[PDB]
Design a protein around this ligand. Structure first.
Ligand SMILES: NC(=O)C1=CN([C@@H]2O[C@H](COP(=O)(O)OP(=O)(O)OC[C@H]3O[C@@H](n4cnc5c(N)ncnc54)[C@H](OP(=O)(O)O)[C@@H]3O)[C@@H](O)[C@H]2O)C=CC1
Ligand SMILES: CCc1nc(N)nc(N)c1C#C[C@H](C)c1cc(-c2ccncc2)ccc1OC
Length: 246
C-alpha cells in the first residue's frame, strides 16, 4: 500500500505556475500558509523566520496569479505588512494573463474599526477593499472616504460577515481568483463556514516548541477531507504542498 516519493522532475519557470493555475471559470478561494513540523505557524510573532527563498518564491508567485488578496485586519496591522508589490516582470505576466498590474487587496473586519492612518492605506499603489458588515458599512465608508471602497458582506445577519457572501461579493467585482495569507482567525472562519477550496501549505523543516499557535485559531471543529494535488521540494528540505477539497 505504501509508496516512496522522490524528486522526479525539475520545474521550468513556466511549469511552476501551471501547477498553481486557478480554475478556468467560477470563483476559487485559495489559502497559502506556512507551518513547522509541529504545527507552529509563528516564530516570535513573525512567520517570516521559517520562510526561506523557496517559500518566498512560491509566495510571490501565488500573489501574481490572484485577482485579489483577502487578509484579516489583525494581520494587516503587524509590523511590516506592506502593500502588494508587483515587480516589473510580474506585472508583465499578469497583463499577458489579462489581469491588472497588481492584485487588489481586501481587508476583513466585523467591527469596522480601521484607522485612516494605517500602513496598508498609505503605501499601496491602489486603494484596498474593506469587507465588513451591513451594520457598520456606511459609517466605515464615511470614515475612510478616498482610502478604500467599503463593501457590506452580511448574509442574513447584519451584525456579522457571511464568508460565502464575502467570496460572492468579490466575484461580483470580477475578482473570482482569490488568495488568503492570514491570519489564523480569518482562515478559521473560512474553514468553519466551509468556503475554502484549496490549501497551499509550506512545511518548514523545524520544530518550534509548544508556545506558537496553529495556522488556524477559533472555536471551530470540523473534519474537512482534502485531496493531495502535488508536493514540491527544494534542496533545503521544505515541502510545498497543494491540497484541494473534497
Ligand atoms: N499563520 C500565519 O502564518 C500567520 C500568523 N500571524 C500571527 O497571528 C497573529 C494574528 O492573528 P489574527 O489576529 O487572528 O489575524 P487576523 O488577520 O485573523 O485578524 C482577525 C480580524 O479580522 C476581522 N474579521 C471580521 N470578520 C471576520 C471573519 N469572518 N473572519 C476573519 N476575520 C474577520 C476581525 O477584525 P475586527 O476585530 O475589526 O472585527 C478579526 O479580529 C499575530 O500575532 C501574527 O504574528 C499573522 C499572519 C499569518
Ligand atoms: C512568506 C511567508 C509565508 N509563507 C507562506 N507559505 N504562507 C504565508 N501565508 C506566509 C506569510 C505571511 C505573512 C502574511 C507575512 C508575510 C510577509 C512576507 C512575505 C514575503 N516576503 C517577505 C515578507 C511579511 C509579513 C507577513 O505578515 C505580517
Amino acid at each position: 500500500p505504501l509508496r516512496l516519493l522522490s524528486s522526479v522532475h525539475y520545474l521550468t519557470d513556466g511549469e511552476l505556475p501551471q501547477l498553481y493555475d486557478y480554475p478556468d471559470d467560477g470563483t476559487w478561494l485559495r489559502a497559502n500558509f506556512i507551518s513547522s513540523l509541529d504545527g507552529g505557524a509563528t516564530v516570535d510573532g513573525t512567520s517570516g523566520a521559517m520562510a526561506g527563498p523557496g517559500d518566498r518564491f512560491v509566495f510571490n508567485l501565488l500573489r501574481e496569479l490572484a485577482d485579489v488578496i483577502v487578509v484579516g485586519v489583525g494581520t494587516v496591522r503587524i509590523e511590516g505588512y506592506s502593500g502588494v508589490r508587483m515587480g516589473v516582470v510580474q506585472r508583465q505576466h499578469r497583463q499577458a494573463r489579462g489581469q491588472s498590474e497588481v492584485p487588489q487587496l481586501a481587508i476583513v473586519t466585523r467591527s469596522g474599526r480601521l484607522d485612516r492612518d494605517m500602513a496598508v492605506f498609505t503605501r499601496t499603489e491602489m486603494a484596498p477593499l474593506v469587507l465588513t458588515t451591513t451594520a457598520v458599512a456606511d459609517d466605515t465608508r464615511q470614515r475612510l472616504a478616498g482610502l478604500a471602497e467599503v463593501i457590506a458582506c452580511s448574509g442574513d445577519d447584519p451584525g456579522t460577515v457571511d464568508e460565502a457572501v464575502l467570496v460572492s461579493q468579490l466575484a461580483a467585482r470580477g475578482l473570482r481568483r482569490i488568495l488568503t495569507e492570514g491570519g489564523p482567525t480569518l482562515l478559521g472562519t473560512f474553514v468553519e463556514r466551509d468556503v475554502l477550496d484549496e490549501l497551499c501549505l509550506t512545511i518548514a523543516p523545524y520544530v518550534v516548541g509548544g508556545l506558537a499557535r496553529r495556522i488556524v485559531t477559533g472555536p471551530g471543529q470540523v473534519l474537512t477531507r482534502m485531496r493531495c494535488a502535488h508536493v514540491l521540494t527544494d534542496d533545503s528540505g521544505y515541502l510545498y504542498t497543494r491540497y484541494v477539497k473534497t
